């Protein structure tokens, strides 16, 4: 087509979605991790994660207001990944990299799994 | 902080939100314009428009599944702006610029109003 494009539009949209999350506006699901609860927007979770995409496209699960993750999932790893979904920023540290990579593999967040693998390989 | 950032994350999120819109997945509102109906995600509309932000933060209107726009709003102008919200791409043409600018002013989409004003000023 002959469209023009606003470079900062996608980043501005994500920033606003994160502001709605902060203020708990229109959040429609609670993700339960080892008795730690995280409120979010189903659409943002689906847009970021192959696991949430599969969950919320399921005819029965699409209607659930609570999703319980596997007990092996670490709440801090989940929290770091949820922050990444809403900001593009990943708080990757020596002390959390193993939990973050394991959580990203479970959530099916391929780009995060890729940078964790590379950061681990550099330290060996 | 000491975060790393994935450059394409925001664009990839918006692309996936547009794929959900295309497939009518988790859309939670119908916008009615001069008897033309547009399905969308309330959160994306709020993230893009000052008008939708004000509508869906209202304690009564946040729960509506149908929103009727002012009868002066042109459905084509709305359609072009809805496409912009989900893609960052604006199909601005000599034949639609007046309707697009009027719709962007009503929706409170300041960056769109700005480029329309500039494109109109260049033609005078």
């Amino acid at each position: 087509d002959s469209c023009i494009q606003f470079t900062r539009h996608a980043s501005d949209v994500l920033l606003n979605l994160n502001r709605l999350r902060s203020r708990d506006i229109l959040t429609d699901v609670v993700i339960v991790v080892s008795r730690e609860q995280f409120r979010a927007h189903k659409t943002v979770l689906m847009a970021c994660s192959g696991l949430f995409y599969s969950i919320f496209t399921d005819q029965l699960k699409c209607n659930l207001s609570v999703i319980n993750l596997d007990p092996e999932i670490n709440p801090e790893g989940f929290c770091i990944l949820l922050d990444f979904m809403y900001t593009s920023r990943l708080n990757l540290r020596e002390g959390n990299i193993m939990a973050v990579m394991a959580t990203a593999m479970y959530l099916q967040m391929e780009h995060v799994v890729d940078t964790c693998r590379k950061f681990i390989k550099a330290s060996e | 902080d000491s975060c790393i950032q994935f450059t394409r994350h925001a664009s990839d999120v918006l692309l996936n939100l547009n794929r959900l819109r295309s497939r009518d997945i988790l859309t939670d509102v119908v916008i009615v314009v001069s008897r033309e109906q547009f399905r969308a995600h309330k959160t994306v509309l709020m993230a893009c428009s000052g008008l939708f932000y004000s509508i869906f933060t209202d304690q009564l209107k946040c729960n509506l599944s149908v929103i009727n726009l002012d009868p002066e709003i042109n459905p084509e102008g709305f359609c072009i702006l809805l496409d912009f919200m989900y893609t960052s791409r604006l199909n601005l043409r000599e034949g639609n610029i007046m309707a697009v600018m009027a719709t962007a002013m009503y929706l409170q989409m300041e960056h769109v109003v700005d480029t329309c004003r500039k494109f109109i000023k260049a033609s005078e």
Partner: peptide, 4 residues
Amino acid sequence: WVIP
């Protein structure tokens, strides 16, 4: 704004 840019030409994509």
